[PDB]
């Protein structure tokens, strides 16, 4: 047995998924109250993409220019405006399934569930992480743009991501629900590539704590180490320099197990050098880095409120 | 080019069926479709009971009044009951309006599904897994996930296949199908029972290696193919299920696609097995995955 990387229940977000078509282009859109958000490039097709000038293209678009459907029911768009890389379409209808929500920009390393969609229809839901290079390694085949990344805290949905394009790498680039891209990517099919990727040290550590929490603690030892000396080691195996801030995000976890952050660092330091000896951790073969210090708490407790 | 994630189905249609069933100081999840509410029968057991309980005896001494059903902040008047193998079928007055098109189907070891993990009839998370070969299923079940269901979705039809019943000692989980029939040599009793000897699901691993190739990655191939029995003779040794001609055929379109003979992919596996993965990685993974059926790959490599 082991530990599962669970995705938030997609119910609440499913009820906000719609299809947005502009001529020959069709993608997904977020329907929150009387507005539909979607990648601004919905207004493009063919060579436009090879460096368009949205301002002008938009200025030559009208409401009837946008067809939008929720199921087999049209939503008449009665207004339109651009916000950075996002397009905000006003509709003659308020989404009665609109959940309590909010938009938050995420920081590299944090996580969220993605509800993959095609032609305004849900397809599957998965859990991923905003990679240190500002890209996500999801599964976004043809026309997944407009799909969104969210988190849930009680009855509130925190939309934090929206898929726009595919980087050569086979990784994705998107924005926050306020039209700002993540990383140095622009919504123009130009020569652009992801920077160098690293393992999210903070999450690997959170994962060990989770391992421990579950009785899988053979990899521990009596010694600690310097935040500095750990980094000189991580930097060799391609781990992100651990920081004071990081050590603090691990506080509740370090508190629940009684294992100080540095103590656990010495532990990781070895699972890195001194291979692993064919042994395991939460079953799996390698150290997982897509569970945050909050995901571990969240999943190791069916928490309050109701 | 690439990017292969293990996706689960949208839990939306199932969340709309999750409720809470309490009997005495005991509480777990329940599935609510139309006017029936399903859940493990051991809801009616307290401490002792669980140690060799005569359920037929325990049930007659129970009445509709004993069953507290809660749809959020709304009780449901249970108007009758009856047991079906290991499940409980409580009738109620209110028919669940959110009941989707549903089908009860018995899955097979190796087949994959999505579990809607709940605690107190309240959605907590969704994940994709495989019915392990020993019938158990490693999950994120902890305390009261009992009653949570496993499923598949086609079009708009939800196919309920599993329902969590108990956490076995090893730390894995046992459950029954939506008909109360258990998966595996298990029973709803706290006794001396553990998971059978588990094995890796070869058919899936291969599929995953095809999936790995189509996305662009193929550092593990080798033009020098092997025979079907010789692969088994080798796989069985590393604790992988034997591969029948039936599995090979299954990897038909996956091969025809990547343009690699199943038997060939097998030779590549025989190596990945013996030559411990060079320390490198396949599909961003660091270990061979087997929770992807040859179909899970087709689905995630073409349409919806």
Swiss-Prot record, chain A:
| Cytoplasmic face residues | 1-306
Q: Result of mutating residue 248 to E?
A: In strain: Isolate BJ04
Quote the catalytic residue positions.
41, 145
* Cellular compartments annotated: Host cytoplasm; Host Golgi apparatus
Reactions catalysed: TSAVLQ-|-SGFRK-NH2 and SGVTFQ-|-GKFKK the two peptides corresponding to the two self-cleavage sites of the SARS 3C-like proteinase are the two most reactive peptide substrates. The enzyme exhibits a strong preference for substrates containing Gln at P1 position and Leu at P2 position
List each copy of the Peptidase C30 domain by range. 1-306
Q: What does this protein do?
A: Cleaves the C-terminus of replicase polyprotein at 11 sites. Recognizes substrates containing the core sequence [ILMVF]-Q-|-[SGACN]. Also able to bind an ADP-ribose-1''-phosphate (ADRP). May cleave host ATP6V1G1 thereby modifying host vacuoles intracellular pH.
The protein's assembly and partners: Exists as monomer and homodimer. Only the homodimer shows catalytic activity.
Q: What protein does this entry describe?
A: 3C-like proteinase nsp5
User: Which organism is the protein's source?
Assistant: Severe acute respiratory syndrome coronavirus
Parent-protein residues present: 3241 to 3546 of 4382
From Swiss-Prot, chain B:
Peptidase C30 domain span: 2-304
Q: Which parts of the sequence lie on the Cytoplasmic side of the lipid bilayer?
A: 2-304
- State the superkingdom: Viruses
As for subcellular location, the record says: Host cytoplasm; Host Golgi apparatus
Q: Where, by residue number, is the active site? A: 42 (for 3cl-pro activity), 146 (for 3cl-pro activity)
Q: So what does this thing catalyse?
A: TSAVLQ-|-SGFRK-NH2 and SGVTFQ-|-GKFKK the two peptides corresponding to the two self-cleavage sites of the SARS 3C-like proteinase are the two most reactive peptide substrates. The enzyme exhibits a strong preference for substrates containing Gln at P1 position and Leu at P2 position
Q: Please give the function described in this protein's UniProt entry.
A: Cleaves the C-terminus of replicase polyprotein at 11 sites. Recognizes substrates containing the core sequence [ILMVF]-Q-|-[SGACN]. Also able to bind an ADP-ribose-1''-phosphate (ADRP). May cleave host ATP6V1G1 thereby modifying host vacuoles intracellular pH.
Oligomer and partners: Exists as monomer and homodimer. Only the homodimer shows catalytic activity.
> What protein name does the entry list?
3C-like proteinase nsp5
Annotated source species: Severe acute respiratory syndrome coronavirus (SARS-CoV)
Residue span relative to the full protein: 3241 to 3543 of 4382
